[model samples]
Target: SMTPLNNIVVFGDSLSDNGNLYEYMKHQLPQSPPYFEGRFSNGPVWIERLAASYFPNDPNSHLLDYAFGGAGVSVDDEVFFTLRREVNSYLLAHQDKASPDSLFVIWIGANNYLGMPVEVEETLKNVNRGIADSIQRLVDKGAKHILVLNLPDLGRTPAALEFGSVEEMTYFSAQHNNALSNTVDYFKKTYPEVEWLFFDTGSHFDHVIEHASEYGFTNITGTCSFSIVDEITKNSVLKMVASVKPELTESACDGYLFFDLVHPTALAHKIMAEKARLMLDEAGVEFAE
Candidate 1:
């Protein structure tokens, strides 16, 4: 039998952020009542869902997330912190040691494309290099088990669909994922001892979007939390939904893939968490109950 995971440490952006955004914003963002306790989505982010089901008992204590909304691979004062910064903080806190029974999750690079908006080649190089360095840092810290996820097609998002070039966004995201895939392969080749799992999140998202009916989604193309153009109302759309009607937010008649222009809904997060659990199980990683 496989050794159970004792802790889950995650680093990424809004997709994995549970409450660092609200903390960084000084508790201004909506919690629990609407956005599921500081998660950008209308419910808990995928990692939060995964932790709850996997850890079950005092999951928060076992799950350490450094993800924050608007995080990129590098710090942009215009945005929030960076993924490398999260790694720095984690290493500093843990005295540069990684426990064998811990699960380390890294899912980023979307903001560098979505927010920073670099040229395609530079974007690919920068993100892939940053990801590689981050993984190396973890390996240097004695990390053995790691999960690195690729970005979904940004062009398929409601924001890109509404305001950006869908074709360009699609191409950039595809290229980023491809580059990231190869980087993970390189890590596998270089670090034979580390357990690496590259989750094909791009295809998972594409499949979910293309086959929305099977996932019980009604609006795969629109925003569930009232968005105008593509700004997402300063990420307050979910909070506003509480004012209008909370019960109708997850309506069976109007299930949506996105809570805002860039974030997904609770249902989608749930689906992603389930898939991630399945992936871990198949990869021979078991979680502590």
Candidate 2:
């Protein structure tokens, strides 16, 4: 039986989006968009790069990406709807091609923790349940092989950068990120039959910077061009302005790896794919097969 060579689908918010999320946010302006036109972190996202590395030239390999910037599992339900609806649509469209061997990667819930003026404790209580339910819904969608990534430290993003110093923001971020991590662990235990890969988004971010020379990047704390932060607070707002700095240049930055403050640049994406290749291997998934 031949499973689809690249039956890999990625679902999440901006951290996973190479560009689309920024684009969609540009004109609608509550503040500013995340990326300038043509700005993307150096390469494809980790998931896309993973498929390429795993399947190489296999034309049949499929890569489905549904990551949007600023969206969360439950936080933006009024806006983007539930992951269930999205996954249901995906499964419906690709059901014929899906199989037990298919790889479905779900990286979500980051935005659910972000709401204007809400305390971290309050936000977590509101969104954690949605995060949990989103995972369970995916399991019900017949996805046997699923990978769940822990949310990154929310307090560390450019948005959080405004709060006095990184140290202060980190305090809040640790608590929030831990909340997300706890949910991921709960799911792993609850759905033992599913092959689950738990990836730490924070570690993943650090991994790129630690290996920046190999990945060809300079600045890691800044964002790609088109991203805006509040002039006063330095907190990220939705902006799409271009940058004069080579690092902050344009959307094409995709090739560089770390696109902006919180997301991976294309270059970073490639490194992640390679790392995950090893992780998947540890879980007994053979790319060469």
Candidate 3:
């Protein structure tokens, strides 16, 4: 029988980043107003919502989150954190703490596709191996229940639409998802003892993008100017802009599906959490509502 998860450890990029990068940047620009409570989006992401829903009564539960914003599967300097390094950090910190019933959730690779300098094929190889290596390391450390969330439909985002046609973007997304899917399938078959669940974030994004109107999203393509920033200086500039022109930021983002060019709104995060909850229910993993 499935048991309530006693511990949850996360590994990934901004999609799973729970304030590490935000906090770091806040120190760099002490004058900048806090943005969205340290989350990249308008509100809490799926990881936070998942914790709230699954362990509502357990305030003492172990919730270790190591995801960093702009982090990629491979090494990248944009966020200064990588999946490999995040896993290594976890190993160093919790080498003796991992348990068989603990749940390890990984949702990375967006940076690999969006920011990595390498070609797509080479990026795919690196991302595939990188994630596989993380999972292997966790398994070796005695982690049993693992949830691997695949990359979303990056081509459909506003940033991708601005640069390339939707068809091309989707094509690239498919290639990356396929590569990761194949990796997960191989691991599932090879490691029968590990409880692995591969969540299709692509399908989740596709559904919301296709039915944006049904989800209370008035503008699915447009985003606030403050949402797009690469460097700390750029972030400071945007923060100043937002502080000076709050009306402009609110007008541009209100009722939008995306909080920024790439990240989804908090409402979308809620929907994702619900979808994941359904998946867990179907899989018979017992948890709080």
Candidate 4:
């Protein structure tokens, strides 16, 4: 039998975007912000590299990214993410390609669960239903091998480190991640034909959160840039425009885990991707064939 040789679609937030989303969001926020040279906070993210790994033969044409900055799956009108709508529209447009052969990887639902202590238990539970619905929509649209990644532990993020109590933050993170696990289980039992893959990020996040000292990371509580906590410095911005500091000084400041107040750096993206890949292989997507 011939190999499936199909397109790979990525749906998520800044984590999957590399540096594109950060640049876009910055342009929108500041009339003249500092230009981003490469992956905002870390090296090449896993998704950018995974698209190639997932479909090494197809090249650029095989990757389709419908992700945007500041996007979440919750039913918030103000959020302005067209994830569900966009996925449906894309499936409708490619009705001919709609079949049980291709692979669609979906990663979402961090922003909705992030931020301060705001009824995390009730909100995440409700948001999970929306996520399940989104997954089923893809299945109904003719996706057979769908991969849905679980949300990362948000308590370890820079935002949580800044605003909320560590213990309370950990508790809330447990609430949201637990909701995600329950949803993953429900999806597996309810829709066996879909071949849904779930990547647990709980234990995997320890590298950046717990063992951060080993890697010279002060901690995983925040990002490695002023952008995460405050505005970019004028001198730093000037240097980027000039050729003074050609490379991103990810070490000069206490910025390593986050890019901005809420998002993870490129390094975080890479970590998540590695964990996701392992989870997928465990769930049955073979890498070596």
Best by lDDT: 1
Cα TM-score per model: 0.88, 0.72, 0.86, 0.74
Model 1 / residue 213 / CA error / Å: 1.3
- Please say which candidate is ahead in TM-score: 1 or 3: 1
For candidate 1, write residues 1-289 as lDDT tens digits. 1278788999998888889878766666644444567787777788988998876778899899998877777623435677889999988898878777789999988766665254567767877888889999889888889899998888877767766568877887888888888889999999888888878999999899888989989887777655333244323223233233334344442388887667788888899999999998898887764
Cα error, residue 99 of model 2, in Å, equals: 4.1
Predicted structure 2: lDDT: 0.57
lDDT, residue 195, model 3: 84
Candidate 1 lDDT: 0.77
lDDT of 4 by residue, 1-289 (tens): 1135266677765456444454655543311222233333345556766766665675456666666544566543334364676476567678634456556776776655553425756666656776777777777766777777665566665555665545655665677677778777887788777677666666666555767766445545544444422322211222112222324435544336665545555556666666676676676664322
Better of 2 and 4 by TM-score: 4
**Candidate 3 TM-score, true structure as reference:** 0.86
Q: Rate the local accuracy (lDDT) of all candidates.
A: 0.77, 0.57, 0.70, 0.57
With a 3 Å backbone cut-off (N, CA, C), the pairs that clash in candidate 3 are: none
Model 2, residue 276: distance off in Å is: 1.2
Superposed by TM-score, candidate 3 places the C-alpha of residue 168 at a distance from the truth, in angstroms, of 4.8
Better of 1 and 4 by lDDT: 1
Query: Can you give the lDDT of residue 181 in candidate 2?
Result: 77
Clashing pairs in 4: 222-258, 223-255, 223-256, 223-258, 224-255, 224-256, 225-255
